[PDB]
């Protein structure tokens, strides 16, 4: 039945590939996503908007750890977004983990989803993502590193970096504000303030997700005993939120 | 089923025996030139060691004819080995032993390496397979030099073979060196 | 028994700040001495592994680990650490469950990051053997293991480490019949690496 | 018209283009006769012939010792249609040791023409066929069209100007109804029956082919001088 | 519009094609006495340095079995090979030779591959552009000849020709052939037909016969031969 | 689904092909990638295309000890066909116990973008490939792949958006007994003369190197940190 | 899997895809093969391309497929590549299966095959390349050249040229030369193929290439040195 | 059974036994062990004789397609080549073949390729094959000779079956002869081996050790 | 064209999806579901002489604790139910613990994201509604789109006259989360059916599905009329 075995994205008579530009197009109509990298920890943050005012928001999560040092947050469609995160935990358990015994650095895992994101933009019947995700994580070897993935595939690390409608203010503003010298709490402070510009209805704690990549939390490790055994990703409560606003 | 061999200083030196196993009146060579400066003797049970024989010298000179250019004896003697490897763990395992005779030309140096059906590969100065080991290698150990000459290696391998008929007819001995592979006419 | 065709024998110790792993040179088929010149030990950087066992195993697993080694350092930009290294071959081993190669394969090296020494065995179905003192693999495993344990000391200097493990691996494999041709020892610390040939009986 | 490009298209009145323009492939074929009695049934065949120098195309196909066809179309489809049919009689008398009915027989062929007219990458047949047989309920006539309708029917005749044959068989019903036990009247019927559709062209030894079967009578096909006292 | 599409008419546009591709190729003229069957064919040199000996529009089948073809002659590889294997295998499993009329109709399911199989693929994604003119001997029917196209459907006839000058060759062979021809005679018409029908002056390198019989089988006369016999017909037309 | 097929794979009436023109039509807006091969080196030297963000850790990568290339076009496919060569070479490696030459992994690239051209219905790769390499056949190697499966051997050669004024650029001051260092300074008055920028920074460049010795044994390869980049130039005579 | 009829009819009876190949193939360079009494020559033009060229490690366009027969080409050169390793196995097949050496019509006779089964198939593009095959079978001294087309036809010919301007030689081809007495030695034949090359290659002498095949496997790639030597000649003969 | 071909300056002689048995009880005296191939290629039937028939039947067919293709006559290297490329194919099912391939061409002269079901491919002069192989490949060799008459050489391949005959159980019925020469294979005939005894025996003397 | 196929407009959109949303509304019928502390319960405005009226219905028991509602056509609606009465039974046999709402839901969504992105399968006009009482969560109502998009719900409604009743839930939510009262909490939701649409809703122009901790049953007519 399924007679669709030739690409849907190709090259124009111009030299540029469509649906990959439809689809960044698709993102950037996509509410406003940030991520800013310190000394000593990562910050991600996104505003979380309501399809209704019955709905409980807390049961829908726009940043998802995909390992216990790693997190990510997108700007874009919703599903392919948790169509990607459940696809990009599976590889990183089964490319890495399943091998080596520990979970793959940030570089790898990003590698792994840019992999998956171009195999859209080429296999038969198929429609590219449409989404940009910004992911934040820190290993052994190479610490903290922040990197964004475009639709096609393309992934950039970044110092921080913003996604979405208010994309080109919130970078201005950034570039306005780095000074290689932040800790995790400056970059907190700087992330919220770079969001209550973008935020046109209540800027709060229910309408707020923040995310760190920071230090190792055995309070988040139900067991003890082995020495060499931490998660550093961390999502902040609304109660906290609310408390540093 | 005699397949012997001797490193000397320029060249390598090949014997194999010119015998069958019935019924029948016929000369047999058990070598393929492989390159022009690489030679393969072989042994073990019929109808495989041809095939696989065959098999190995078809694919050598499509390599030579695409790049042009002649593989070394190290790459042709890894190439056997990943052969044989790959081939006992198959449904049907070549019981096939080989050695593999080749003049360097990089290198300028002769090399001689010996493969088990297994898949072990060994570089020698001298080796042998079958029984040919067990009432050669005394006589091997004793006078082996690694400067002797092509004709004292000759000499040498002369002396085998005799220890060889007496505990029993003929060998075909071949030569690699610089100038390519030949056939002894004079032994 | 596939094990015990070709023979061979590997042992490895740690030191104070050092390692040492050491083997026997024979290749045999069943009875008959082949080459006095097999090594059974290789190094991916600044890990070593001895196999043990047939010597078409111990040939296919050195090839296949050196590419795996060379793609983890491509896409990691960084060698391999000991500990991640006896996890891969943990994983290698196990993926031949039921067609698995008869090895004998032992891991020894020195953390970049902490300097800790370290030491592994395996199985060869991929089982992981950790120890603090001695990992010994081959024939002569039970000489092996009578050796090392009397004459092993927790904390030994290089130069008392070479002669201690050279000593064992000696003197058990003296009474193997199917090991001694020869005999390399490797002394590895944070900046240098000794290989030294030993003297032995041959017969 | 954009809906007669394929076999999954319905138009906006419901109506299948390529079925309809196999049927208009069938309506050019040669003219072809099928009648029966309670005893025996036949078929009267025109063949046509490219030129002078070129033999006379068969029409009719034997399946199984107690059936056949004719065929008016499209000829590589009604062999493929014809195979078909041989197997499956083979099937019938291999596993169970029985004879297949020519319903049974029908209803198999409306199955596989109905697959070729819903899935896309296959054209429906371009051939109808009209199929005799005799089993233990006597002598079966069948009309098969490439949409997978079958009919059963006393008389029928297919292809170009068979409607005069068709008014001609309708006419005379109950007289070739009752013709028991004569074979040779009911071959005589039929001929006359084909008679009624010819223009310019009169039945010769070359262009007409019959066959019959019946209560003691495998399927038989006559041709040539078999078919002068026919004539 | 598919491969399988039918027109309003009721036929197959790529058969129709096909059949108006076969229209462009060289003349292929068969004649089918009661001595034995004649084909014969004209070879259209695109360039004075090509080599004629090297074009082969006629070839053996089995030994008494001949084809000659005309159209996309890079189509007919695959059907001759299928043609013989045919034939070899037939052989095999019963100890016989096959007959003609089998052998065309193996090779008619073959073209019919482009849909469904005789037996019930898609092997080919488009018809064969060329048309066959398969001659034989046997047993049961004497000698025949058959023209056989890309639709499937063969016919047996007296005498054929095909390619680009078909109508006027098969104009002229409807008043010419009789069933009392002798093999010569047979010889001598199709090199007249080939002579009328082609725009060049009639030669050895231009055209070639063969002919079929049930002695010496299947065999193609070499240029000598064709030489006497177009100095003997030159003779007796002038 | 037929209406929807964009027959990727087909000729035009002039006999070319449609995607592959429009694939190096999309390539020609890439950053400047450039190779220039001397009597004892190569060098690559790619013009990124920026931010103040992070750059020390996206168009030089690696493929085994030996051999490393210049993307040109689609990172993401690109970083495919690395996958695919690092893979070969690996492969080379085990079977023969020897490095890989770098024509043979060059051709089998080439031979994975053509079959893409010519077969399946998918687009081809929108990536050229610039390739430095050495072997004991013909010592240092330089390469060019494109997406119409065609490669090419070079002396010094360019690709990207301004591919005819690097190379009538080189065409001149270009010698066959150059050496390293004059190389580097040629293509970095090359990729300064031709980029349509301000100047020519130390962020907004990737080089590398591929010589004998600089502690290491018979060939290294020395990929360049921004602070080795930023000396070059200033030795050089950039000063940017 | 993608089988999509590319290759299909056209109410005139032609086939579309085929045409176009023959076009692509009208695109390419020029080759020239001429037979001798004993020897075959073939000749082929270089792309005026930059002068930054490396010859060593480019394609010659000149592939032995076996140590007594080679190929040309015109038209894309990746499907030829394609096509030449094809035949290169095929050859080693047969000499495995057989116990001697292809003739030089079988394996003309292979690629036609080949040709015409993409020509044929679905999901796939004809080649858009048109070749020369020459040679000497084995213990035969009678030189064979075949030319085989994108369709899938091939013939022997006693000089033929494809790719580009390929009407303008062969008509000096017609012209000049004499079935009845083919050049005798190979030096006639290699000066009858440059200056039916120089015919259209006005760019000089350097974009010339020649070989020469003769029986019992002597295949020579003449160097640059003697093809200017030829070329030289040619011109000092031109007006006295 | 008892199968024997030789090459000499005439050509080829192959010469077979008609014995076959299943146990102790004779099942045929009337076996054909010379499969024909095609009018100029021989092969003999040692070990199981429907593999044999058919595979050499097969042969034949593979050898008509190769002359169809290539317009020439095949060699008897490339058809020996074919069986034994496709017993290969078939090493460890079960198969038992041992057959010998006789065959005169322009090029190769005459040429015996002995084929064996392991993949044992060997260009010869002299085969036997058969329980009673060793009592004819004395007689052969006490007098084979290259420049022997087409009749002597007739007479020697009767000779040496009659000797296996004589001697194995399992051999004997009656002698098939045939010779090969570079136009084709010619039969000479059947010839009784009780009858033929005695008359041997009369005319050279020997078999003292029988009555008769 | 772009609107034909699932992929995207120049303007970043997907048609058939907003094609498939307006399908959603072919049937003029709305559907309730409210949240009680203990139970969940859903309505729906089941609306010819000839039809058998037990066999009318669009309220289906996914397992022996989760409901659904569907909007839309009914096929798509059937399909949907099998899909998920397979899903339940298969996790439940795989991991040995009753399969969850929200889980259930997510797998839903995940099918109907694969429909939008791949071509050749379409979108199903439809839109699920699940309710369950959790044996971690409590009362659960969580709806999926053709979007793939899903989300949990104190309260939600669904039709074409939704925005009425939503505007009277969140009034009554302002007042003051969930239903402080499972027959309570029905009669609820009768009443605010009738007070957002209007007229008197007799017994057979709704169809009741209530979720409470161990089950989902749907009440029959009887029960419904004892309800008013």
Same mark, same amino acid.
């Given at each position: ?25 698709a ?37 998802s ?111 306005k ?8 709490e ?11 510009e ?10 707020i ?9 055995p ?27 | ?19 069958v ?34 098999? !190995?010298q ?6 030579? !004819? *695409?790049?042009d250019y ?10 056997? *080995? ?21 003049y ?24 042998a ?13 004793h006078?082996?030099r ?5 004709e ?14 007496? *505990? ?20 | ?35 006095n010149?097999?090594?059974?030990i ?80 395996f ?25 090392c ?19 064992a ?28 040939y ?6 | ?58 029409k ?97 005749a ?35 029956a084909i ?6 062209e ?8 019959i ?21 | ?59 053996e089948i ?69 048309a ?10 004497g ?16 005498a ?8 006027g ?10 069933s ?36 010496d ?22 | ?23 190096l039509e ?26 103040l /963000? ?15 290339v ?22 080379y ?64 050669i360019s690709?990207?958006?301004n591919?005819?004024?690097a ?19 040629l ?5 300064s ?6 100047? /020519? ?20 390869q ?19 | ?35 001798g ?49 094809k ?16 003739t ?16 044929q ?6 080649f ?113 | ?14 010469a ?52 169809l ?7 008897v ?13 078939? @090493? ?65 391949? @009767? ?37 033929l005894?005695? @008359?041997? @025996?009369?005319?050279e003397g020997?078999?003292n050790?029988?009555?008769? | ?25 072919? +049937?003029? $019928? ?9 139970? +969940?319960?859903?309505?729906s ?8 009226? +037990? ?6 028991? $996914?397992?022996? +604790? ?7 056509? $009914? ?29 259930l839901?997510?797998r ?44 949990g719900y ?20 302002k ?10 909490v ?13 007229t ?21 007519a ?7």
């Open positions: 039945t399924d007679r669709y075995s030739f690409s849907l994205t190709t090259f124009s008579p111009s030299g540029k590939l469509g649906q990959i530009d439809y689809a960044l197009t993102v950037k109509q996509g509410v406003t996503s940030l991520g800013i990298k310190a000394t000593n920890g990562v910050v991600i943050a996104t505003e979380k908007k309501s399809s209704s005012p019955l709905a409980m928001s807390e049961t829908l999560s726009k940043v750890l995909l390992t216990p040092d790693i997190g990510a947050v997108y700007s874009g469609m919703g599903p392919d977004y948790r169509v990607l995160v459940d696809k990009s935990r599976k590889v990183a358990h089964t490319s890495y983990k399943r091998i080596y015994g520990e979970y793959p650095p940030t570089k790898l895992l990003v590698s792994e989803v840019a992999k998956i994101m171009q195999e859209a933009t080429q296999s038969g019947g198929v429609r590219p993502f449409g989404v940009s995700l910004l992911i934040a994580g820190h290993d052994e070897f190479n610490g903290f590193s922040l990197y964004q993935v475009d639709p096609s595939g393309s992934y950039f690390p970044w110092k921080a970096t913003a996604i979405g409608k208010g994309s080109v203010a919130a970078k201005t503003f950034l570039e504000r780095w000074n290689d010298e932040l800790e995790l400056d970059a907190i402070h700087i992330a919220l303030l770079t969001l209550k973008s935020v046109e209805g209540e800027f709060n704690g229910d309408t997700e923040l995310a760190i990549i920071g230090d190792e939390n309070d988040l490790l139900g067991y003890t005993g082995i020495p060499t055994d931490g998660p550093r990703f961390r999502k902040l409560t609304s109660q906290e939120i609310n408390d540093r606003l | 089923d005699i397949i012997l061999g001797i490193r000397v200083q320029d060249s390598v030196i090949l014997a194999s025996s010119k015998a196993t019935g019924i029948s009146v016929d000369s047999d060579d058990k070598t393929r030139q492989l390159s022009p400066h690489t030679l393969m003797s072989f042994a073990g049970e019929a109808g495989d060691t041809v095939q696989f024989a065959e098999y !190995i078809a694919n050598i000179q499509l390599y030579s !004819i *695409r790049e002649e593989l070394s004896p190290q790459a042709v003697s890894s190439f056997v *080995r990943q052969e044989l490897a790959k081939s006992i763990r198959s449904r049907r395992p070549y019981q096939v032993n080989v050695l593999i005779g080749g360097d030309k990089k290198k300028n140096k002769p090399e001689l390496y010996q493969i088990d059906y297994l898949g072990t590969k060994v570089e020698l100065p001298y080796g397979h079958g029984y040919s080991g067990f009432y050669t290698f005394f006589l091997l150990d006078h082996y690694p400067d002797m000459t092509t004292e290696g000759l000499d040498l391998l002369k002396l085998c073979v005799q220890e060889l008929e007496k *505990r029993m007819k003929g060998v075909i001995v071949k030569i690699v060196d610089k100038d390519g592979i030949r056939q002894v006419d004079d032994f | 028994d596939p094990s015990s065709i070709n023979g061979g024998i590997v042992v490895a110790m740690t030191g104070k700040d050092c390692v040492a792993i050491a083997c026997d040179l024979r290749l045999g088929s069943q009875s008959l001495g082949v080459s010149k097999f090594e059974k290789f190094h991916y950087g600044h890990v070593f592994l001895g196999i043990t066992g047939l010597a078409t195993d111990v040939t296919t697993l050195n090839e296949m680990f050196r590419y795996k080694t060379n793609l983890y350092k491509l896409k990691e930009e960084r060698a391999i650490e000991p500990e991640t290294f006896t996890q891969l071959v943990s994983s290698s081993l196990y993926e031949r469950r039921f067609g698995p190669y008869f090895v004998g394969p032992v891991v020894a090296g020195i953390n970049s990051k902490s300097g800790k020494p370290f030491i592994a065995g199985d060869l179905i991929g089982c992981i053997d950790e120890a603090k003192d001695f990992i010994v693999s081959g024939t002569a495993s039970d000489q092996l293991f009578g050796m344990e009397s004459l092993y000391e927790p904390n030994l200097e290089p130069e008392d480490l070479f002669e201690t493990i050279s000593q691996l000696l003197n058990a494999a003296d009474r193997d019949a199917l090991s001694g041709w020869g005999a390399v020892v490797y002394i590895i610390k944070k900046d240098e690496v000794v290989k030294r030993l003297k032995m009986r041959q017969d | 018209n954009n809906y007669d490009g394929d076999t999954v298209t319905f138009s906006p009145t419901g109506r299948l283009f390529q079925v309809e323009y196999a049927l208009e492939a069938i309506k050019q074929g040669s003219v072809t006769v099928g009648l029966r009695s309670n005893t025996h049934a036949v078929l009267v065949a025109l063949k046509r012939n490219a030129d002078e120098l070129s033999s006379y195309q068969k009719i196909i034997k399946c199984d010792e107690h059936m056949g066809l004719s065929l008016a179309g499209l000829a590589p489809d009604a062999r493929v249609l014809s195979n078909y049919l041989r197997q499956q009689c083979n099937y019938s008398s291999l596993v169970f040791n029985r004879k297949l009915a020519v319903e049974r027989a029908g209803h198999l062929l409306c199955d596989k023409a109905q697959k070729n007219t819903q899935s896309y990458g296959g054209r429906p047949y371009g051939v109808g066929l009209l199929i005799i047989g005799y089993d233990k309920s006597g002598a079966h006539l069948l009309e098969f069209q490439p949409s997978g309708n079958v009919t059963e029917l006393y008389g029928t297919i292809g170009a100007r068979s409607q005069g044959a068709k008014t001609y068989l309708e006419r005379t019903l109950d007289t070739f109804i009752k013709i028991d036990g004569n074979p040779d009247e009911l071959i005589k019927a039929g001929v006359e008679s009624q559709s010819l223009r310019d009169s039945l010769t030894v070359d262009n007409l082919s066959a019959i079967v019946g209560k003691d009578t495998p399927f038989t096909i006559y041709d040539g001088e078999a078919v002068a006292k026919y004539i | 519009r598919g491969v399988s599409t039918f027109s309003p008419e009721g036929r197959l546009f790529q058969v129709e094609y096909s059949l108006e591709a076969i229209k462009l190729g060289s003349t292929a003229i068969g004649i089918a006495t009661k001595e034995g069957v004649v084909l014969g064919v004209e070879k259209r040199a695109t360039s004075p340095l090509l080599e004629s000996d090297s074009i082969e529009k006629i070839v089995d030994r008494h079995i001949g084809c000659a073809m005309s159209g996309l002659t890079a189509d007919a590889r695959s059907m001759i090979e299928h043609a013989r294997t045919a034939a070899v295998t037939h052989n095999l499993y019963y100890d016989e030779d096959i007959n003609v009329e089998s052998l065309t109709q193996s090779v008619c399911d073959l073209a019919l591959r482009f849909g469904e199989g005789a037996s019930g693929e898609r092997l080919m994604s488009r018809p064969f552009g060329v066959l003119l398969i001659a034989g001997h046997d047993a049961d029917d000698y025949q000849l058959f023209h056989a196209e890309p639709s499937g459907t063969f016919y047996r006839y007296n054929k020709a095909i390619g680009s000058g078909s109508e060759a098969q104009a002229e062979l409807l008043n010419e052939w009789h009392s021809l002798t093999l010569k005679e047979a010889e001598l018409l199709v090199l007249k037909i080939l002579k009328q029908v082609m725009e060049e002056k009639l030669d050895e390198n231009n055209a070639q016969l063969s002919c079929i019989t049930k002695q089988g299947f065999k193609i006369y070499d240029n000598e031969k064709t030489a006497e016999l177009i100095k003997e017909l030159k003779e007796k037309e002038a | 689904s037929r209406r929807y097929d964009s027959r990727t794979t087909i000729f035009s009436p002039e006999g070319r092909l449609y995607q592959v023109e429009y694939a999309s390539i020609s807006h890439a950053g400047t990638a450039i190779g220039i091969m001397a009597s004892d080196g190569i060098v690559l030297a790619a013009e990124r295309k920026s931010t /963000l992070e750059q020390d850790t996206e168009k030089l990568y690696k493929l085994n000890d030996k051999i490393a210049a993307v040109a076009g689609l990172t993401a496919d690109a970083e495919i066909l690395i996958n695919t060569a690092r893979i070969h070479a690996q492969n490696l085990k079977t023969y116990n020897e490095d890989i030459p770098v024509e043979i992994l060059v051709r089998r690239l080439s031979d994975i973008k053509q079959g893409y051209t010519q077969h399946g219905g998918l687009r081809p790769f929108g990536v050229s490939f610039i390739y430095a390499g050495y072997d004991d056949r013909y010592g240092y190697q330089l390469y060019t792949s494109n997406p119409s499966g065609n490669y090419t051997g070079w002396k010094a690709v990207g958006a591919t005819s004024a190379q009538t650029l080189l065409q001149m001051d270009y010698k066959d007994d150059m050496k390293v260092d004059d190389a580097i300074e293509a970095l008055k090359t990729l003369k031709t980029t349509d920028s301000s100047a /020519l920074t130390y962020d907004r460049l990737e080089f590398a190197t591929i010589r004998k010795g600089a502690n290491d044994g018979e060939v290294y020395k990929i360049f940190k921004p602070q080795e980049i930023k000396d070059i130039l200033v030795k050089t005579g950039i000063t940017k | 899997g993608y089988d999509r009829a590319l290759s299909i009819f056209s109410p005139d009876g032609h086939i579309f895809q085929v045409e176009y190949a023959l076009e692509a193939v009208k695109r390419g360079t020029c080759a020239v093969g001429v037979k009494k004993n020897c075959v020559v073939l000749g082929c033009e270089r792309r005026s391309t930059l002068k930054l060229q490396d010859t060593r490690i480019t394609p010659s366009k000149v592939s032995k497929i076996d140590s007594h027969v080679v190929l040309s080409f015109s038209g894309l050169n990746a499907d030829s590549r394609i096509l030449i390793e035949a290169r196995v095929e050859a080693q097949s047969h000499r495995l299966t057989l116990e001697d050496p292809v030089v019509e079988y394996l003309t006779r292979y690629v036609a095959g080949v040709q015409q089964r993409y020509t198939s679905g999901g796939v593009r004809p858009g390349v048109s070749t020369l095959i020459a040679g000497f079978d084995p213990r035969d001294d009678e030189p064979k050249l075949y030319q085989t087309e994108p369709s899938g036809i091939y013939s022997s010919w006693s000089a033929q040229t494809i790719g580009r301007n390929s009407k303008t030689v062969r008509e000096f081809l017609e012209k000049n030369y004499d079935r009845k007495e083919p050049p005798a030695t190979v030096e006639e034949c290699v000066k009858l193929t440059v200056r039916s090359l120089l015919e259209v290659v006005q760019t000089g002498a350097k974009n010339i290439e020649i070989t020469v095949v003769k029986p019992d496997s002597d295949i020579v790639a003449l160097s640059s040195e003697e093809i200017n030597q030829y070329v030289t000649q040619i011109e000092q003969e031109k007006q006295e | 059974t008892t199968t024997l071909a030789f090459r000499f300056q005439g050509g080829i002689i192959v077979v036994d008609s014995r076959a048995t299943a146990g102790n009880w004779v099942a045929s005296q009337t076996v054909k062990k010379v499969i024909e191939i095609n009018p100029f290629l021989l092969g003999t039937m040692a070990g199981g004789a429907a593999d044999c028939q058919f595979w050499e039947t097969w042969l034949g067919s593979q050898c008509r397609l190769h002359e293709r290539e317009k020439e006559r095949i060699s290297a490339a058809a020996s080549k074919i069986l034994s490329n496709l017993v290969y194919q078939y @090493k460890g099912a079960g198969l038992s073949m041992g057959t010998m391939i006789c065959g005169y061409t322009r090029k190769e002269g005459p040429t015996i390729y002995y084929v064996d079901s392991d993949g044992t491919r060997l260009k010869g002069d002299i085969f036997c094959v058969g329980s009673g192989q060793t009592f004819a490949y004395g007689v052969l060799d006490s007098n084979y000779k290259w420049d022997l008459s087409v009749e002597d050489a007739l007479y020697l391949g @009767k000779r040496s079956i009659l000797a296996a005959a004589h001697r194995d159980a399992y051999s004997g019925g009656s002698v098939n002869l045939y010779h090969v020469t570079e136009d084709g294979w010619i039969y000479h005939g059947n010839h009784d081996v009780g009858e005894f005695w @008359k041997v @025996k009369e005319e020997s078999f050790n029988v009555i008769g | 064209y772009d609107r034909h196929i699932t992929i995207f407009s120049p303007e970043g959109r997907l048609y058939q999806v907003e094609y498939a949303f307006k399908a959603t509304n072919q +049937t003029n $019928i709305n559907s309730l579901a409210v949240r009680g502390k203990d139970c +969940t319960v859903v309505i405005q089941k609306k010819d002489k000839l039809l058998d009226p +037990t066999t009318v219905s669009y309220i289906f028991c $996914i397992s022996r +604790t989760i409901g659904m509602v569907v909007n839309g056509p $009914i096929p798509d609606a059937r399909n949907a139910a099998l899909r998920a009465k397979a899903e339940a039974a298969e996790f439940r046999y795989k991991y040995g613990y009753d399969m969850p709402c929200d889980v839901a997510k839903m969504a995940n099918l109907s994201q694969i429909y939008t992105q791949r071509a050749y399968m379409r979108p199903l006009g439809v839109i699920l509604t699940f309710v369950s009482v959790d044996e971690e969560l409590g009362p659960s109502i969580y709806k999926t789109d053709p979007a793939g998009y899903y989300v104190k309260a939600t409604a669904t039709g074409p006259k939704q925005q009425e009743i939503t505007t009277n839930l969140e009034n009554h939510f007042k003051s989360d969930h239903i402080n009262e499972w027959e309570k029905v009669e609820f939701a009768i009443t605010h059916m009738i007070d957002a649409l209007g008197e809703f007799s017994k057979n122009d709704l169809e009741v599905g209530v979720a409470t901790k161990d089950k989902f049953f749907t009440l029959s009887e029960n419904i009329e004892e309800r008013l």
